[PDB]
């Protein structure tokens, strides 16, 4: 969320290992409805942001 905000603020953001961050997020999505719903919401946010 914060690196996306840095992109919207036009601050030239960068990373060193992004797939590690994704693999760390996806490590926690197992079986809880509420968390999976938050993740779905985050994907919708990335779709409507990042434009």
């Amino acid at each position: 969320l914060l690196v996306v905000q840095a992109l919207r603020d036009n601050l030239e953001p960068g990373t060193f290992d992004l797939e590690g961050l994704y693999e760390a997020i996806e490590e926690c999505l197992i079986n809880d409805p509420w968390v999976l719903l938050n993740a779905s919401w985050f994907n919708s946010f990335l779709t409507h942001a990042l434009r």
């Binding site: 969320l1 914060l2 840095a6 601050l11 030239e12 060193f16 490590e27 919401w41 919708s44 946010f45």
Partner: protein, 744 residues
Amino acid sequence: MDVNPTLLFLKVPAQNAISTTFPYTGDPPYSHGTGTGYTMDTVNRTHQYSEKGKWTTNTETGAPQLNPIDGPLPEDNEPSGYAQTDCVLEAMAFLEESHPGIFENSCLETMEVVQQTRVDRLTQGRQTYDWTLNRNQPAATALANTIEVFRSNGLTANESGRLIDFLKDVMESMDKEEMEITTHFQRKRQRTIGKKKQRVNKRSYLIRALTLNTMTKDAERGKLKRRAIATPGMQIRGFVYFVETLARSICEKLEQSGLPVGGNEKKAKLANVVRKMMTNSQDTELSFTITGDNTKWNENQNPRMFLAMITYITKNQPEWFRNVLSIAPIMFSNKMARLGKGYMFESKSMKLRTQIPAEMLASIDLKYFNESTRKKIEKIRPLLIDGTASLSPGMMMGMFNMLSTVLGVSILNLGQKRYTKTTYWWDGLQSSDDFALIVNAPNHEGIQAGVDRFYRTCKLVGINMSKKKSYINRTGTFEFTSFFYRYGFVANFSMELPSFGVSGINESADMSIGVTVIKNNMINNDLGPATAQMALQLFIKDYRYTYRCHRGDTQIQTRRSFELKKLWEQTRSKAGLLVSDGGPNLYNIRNLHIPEVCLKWELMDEDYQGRLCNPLNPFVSHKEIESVNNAVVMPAHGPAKSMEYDAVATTHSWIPKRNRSILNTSQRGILEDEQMYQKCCNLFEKFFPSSSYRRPVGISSMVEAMVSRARIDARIDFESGRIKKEEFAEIMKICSTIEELRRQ
């Protein structure tokens, strides 16, 4: 329409709404059983990231110790504990070069502290692992048992009352063949409670003095998986006290540190530093900020580098100072680790369960365990000595954070543009396992080169950066220890959310703390006035339901809904009663800074006023000035801090009861010792009233001073005052019998 709160971040920035991203209204994760597995994981990890070093066997413990210092250089971006001495010392040298006189002055201050301080300073702190019992006990209990065994053996220098003499004693105790200790038991059929002597050979005493206890950390916010932590003993405590004193003194003089400052001091320093950087930076220069965490920070950092640092900072000082600061990194380079509770086993067919202690993992068949645990034990079995694993190549969580910050600032000081010898440069802010770097250069190529050089200069010392959790943007926005800076620091308010309920101390204290956190959050955070009124209302509901103190004009049946109604009907002025006695709430924003007794003192009835505020009440207990109006509270993302609350001593200022489980254990005889000591000390405060305000001083037995003062007060009070002749003769007779009992 399907609802999505995250879309709110499409209009409001993420820092001005970051409070939404903190789920601190729910229960936090807890551990349930043993922590042996996480201990094994940490041991095998820090032996993995330092594996190309050389092995040795200590002559004193017999333990296999891995030395990675001045080992090979890394070839990939994986973690490494291969530190180089020459580069550490070059870092320290250039640090002193840029900030001269820092080590001299810090050493002088610490020399004064070393010479003056006392053993009682070890009584105040956190729990402590007691080798006498092979578990954790409070600090003063551990100190007392250690002193008892020392005096039982022959080491008696601590009678001087200084700390350094106690350290001389613990050093002299290692050169003894057979130490002796005493252990508690109890037997019931009749509850017999006694003691028994046992012996400890020299190597056993060494492994017990060098070992640390381990346990799993509950109530962690922000992690899917649980972590292990360590607790050090009594013998490694004074040395590390002096070492952290030195490190504090140094880090105070550095504009980059963040560890010795808390609260708004921290944010102020951070902001001043950022402004200073952006002023020294040029206008044609491009500027970037890395928000960074370090990975495996406490496993790579080696005590031998700390010994190098110490010997460079004590350069040209007296050898006693150099030798009393050199002992902590030694003892943390030959350290061990208790594995823990063990494991538990299950049989479904026979319907039974069992426990397995950690002191048989070397002598147990591995059929029972699953694959991960089998591998763990298979790797660790070489390092086992008497139920504790050798662990040389790294620290543990929560120790030497100050000196580690000193090393971090040493690396940050290598970006001064007279040490890079180029046109890029860098600076930043450091706390233990977190940092903010700021890099300046005229192009993006210089930015990449500075980032690369920072990474490599930090890998030459054993400082690894987490690429998975770090990111670089332009200057203006960053994150540091859950402080979100966006052209200025920003309020969050969800870190402070579990502090808005009943604290669980007593009625008066919980009331005062409850109103005080509201006005604090009004000052420091951005809690508005209406929301604060609502917070009052909700706090008072929780207060009333917890403590069973409803308005008195209500029909809510509780166990004390009858006494409160009788009090209600006796009372004429009902706005003068306390919420704990069934009265209204007269609080608002105007008057959040006033206690509950002074707020309503002209509204009270005189009989109620005199009953409530009475010194003869049996409910109040004040013991020492450092514990009068001061309570331990447990925030989110921090250690248990101490909060000062303004209150008046009333009959509501009660203490609650104790755990009472220890009655069923072998160590039941600690209660009797506690009880007897408390009898004696209470009587001493009867004779000497100042003993609870000012520390006494003396060498005589307590009874001697007591009977002496009795005689003196008797004489002075008979001469001109109250005491007649009969009392005088009788109490002098009692003094005489006390002498006949003590001297024979």
